[PDB]
């Protein structure tokens, strides 16, 4: 009574409809800031003018 | 609850409830142990 286990399982089944098929999500977070950049796009440099 | 029943296995009795203030905290004294299974709504937040 008023005691619950928070963990529940999806139990995915292919026979389920569109709203129950499992989906894989990858969330990318960037941080545009004044600090020096480590990761950068694939672009070609040029001589200093 | 706390009332007589009819042989409604074939013909379930339907009660329409409207225009009232509903409380569920009193339904926890039905028996020493009973199932309060819920589908589609979490057991909590029912009042809200
Ligand atoms: C139902 O009856 C039992 C025993 O008579 C009592 O303990 C309980 O409070 C009652 N519940 C309601 C909702 O009247």
Task: Give B6-33 as a DSSP string.
Answer: ---SSS-------SS----GGGGGS-SS
Q: Which residue, among B22, B18, B19, B28, has the nearest Cα to B46 in the 3D structure?
A: B22
With an 8 Å Cβ cutoff, are B43 and A4 in contact? yes
Distance of CA A10 to the CA centre of its chain: 19
Which atom of ligand 1 is found nearest the CA of B2? 1
Whole-angstrom Cα distance, residue A30 to residue A43? 18
Whole-angstrom Cα distance, residue B47 to residue A4? 18
User: Interior CA angle at A35 toward A31 and A39, to 5°?
Assistant: 60
Q: For tokens 């004294």, what's the residue?
A: B29
Q: Which residue, among A12, A8, A30, has the nearest Cα to A22 in the 3D structure?
A: A12
Resolution in A: 3.0
Residue B19, exposed/middle/buried by CB under 10 A (0-12, 13-18, 19+)?
exposed
Ligand 1 close to Cβ of residue B28 (< 6 A): no
With an 8 Å Cβ cutoff, are A1 and B28 in contact? yes
Max CA separation in chain B (angstroms): 34
């Amino acid at each position: 009574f008023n005691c619950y286990f928070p963990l529940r399982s999806y139990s995915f089944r292919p026979t389920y409809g569109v709203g129950h098929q499992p989906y894989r999500v990858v969330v990318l977070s960037f941080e545009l800031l004044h600090a020096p950049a480590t990761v950068c796009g694939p672009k070609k440099s040029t001589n200093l003018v | 609850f706390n009332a007589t029943r009819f042989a409604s296995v074939y013909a379930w009795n339907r009660k329409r409830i409207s225009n009232c203030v509903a409380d569920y905290s009193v339904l926890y004294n039905l028996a020493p142990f009973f199932t309060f299974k819920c589908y589609g709504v979490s057991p909590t937040k029912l009042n809200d």
